[PDB]
Structure formats: C-alpha cells, structure tokens
C-alpha cells in the first residue's frame, strides 16, 4: 500500500494539483541457504522457538529472527516446551542449555 517492501515511513510533497508521496521502504537482500527443523527434542520433550527459526549451518543448531541473520545459542529462554517428542514430524535432537545450571546458585 505504502510502497513496495516493508514500509517504514512516508513524506508528502505538494504538486500543482496533487501530492507526491516519498515512501521509505526496507528491502532484504543477500540471502543464504540453511537447513532447518520444526522442533528440537531434548530430554524427551519437544522444544519450539518463541520467536525465530531453528537454523542449522551444517553442524550446529541456532535460533535466529526471521528477517535478518543473527544466530544465537539455543537456551531455555528463547524456546518453549510442549509434550513428548514423538508426535512431531521432522524433530531433531540437540542440547538445550539452561542458564541457571552453570551459575549453580
């Protein structure tokens, strides 16, 4: 509606009999391939991402926001659990660290 791409803002400019809108849009570029899975199985329960996608770069699994590559280590803060891990199709296995354990308070 307000230009091609994800809209940021727009500035109006007068014209003799109309308006001229200068839409400022954000457009992605420089994409890259990745391997993914819908859920991670750890301790027998399935984990899903709160926001983002489980993306693997060949040997390690990470979580990343959808529109810009920013991989993070999979932890209990950015994933949530639901039931045992045998109903989901495409589930994978990996260590899901819990930050309270290393502190050992």
């Amino acid at each position: 509606f307000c230009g091609k791409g994800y809209h940021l803002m727009s500035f109006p400019q007068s014209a003799p009999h109309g308006v001229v809108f200068l839409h400022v849009t954000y457009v992605p570029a420089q994409e890259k391939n990745f391997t993914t899975a819908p859920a991670i199985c750890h301790d027998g329960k399935a984990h899903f991402p709160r926001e983002g996608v489980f993306v693997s770069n060949g040997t390690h699994w990470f979580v990343t926001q959808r529109n810009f590559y920013e991989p993070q280590i999979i932890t209990t803060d950015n994933t949530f659990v639901s039931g045992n891990c045998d109903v989901v199709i495409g589930i994978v296995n990996n260590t899901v660290y819990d930050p309270l354990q290393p502190e050992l308070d």
Binding site: K4, P28, E31, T36, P38, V87, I89
Partner: protein, 88 residues
Amino acid sequence: FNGLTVLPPLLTDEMIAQYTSALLAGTITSGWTFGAGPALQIPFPMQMAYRFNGIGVTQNVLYENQKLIANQFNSAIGKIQDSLSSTP
C-alpha cells in the same frame, strides 16, 4: 455490419493463466516474501505455522495436528469444485 466492432484484449487467456500460475508457485514455496523482494524458500508446514502464529494461536497447535489439518484442507478444496458445478 453496421459499424460496430469488438476489439480483442491484449493479454490472451493463456498468458493470464501463466501469470496466475506464477503467483501460485511463489506463494506455495516462499510465502509472503516473494512480494517484498527476493523470494526465499521455506518448507510449507513451517509457512502455515507462521500464519497460525499470525492469528494468535501458538504453532505447536499446528505441528500436533498436521495430519488432521491437511485432511480438512484437502476436503474443503474438493468440495469447492462440486459446489461450483452444482450451483446454477
């Protein structure tokens, strides 16, 4: 005649069907992204999980009912054609 003529359209029916097929393939393999820039491929179940999340239902609901959901979608698409043919 008496001076009245119908001119043909510029895009023939075949070419319009080709444009439509382009839109379908794009939406099936890349979701919304092909409309905002470079088309990025994404598995179709994950795309529908995105959209489920979009209406405020957590995605675990889709991965746990993938089979049932796929059957309902197939049945609905199947009844559409019968309805169009029987409807006068």
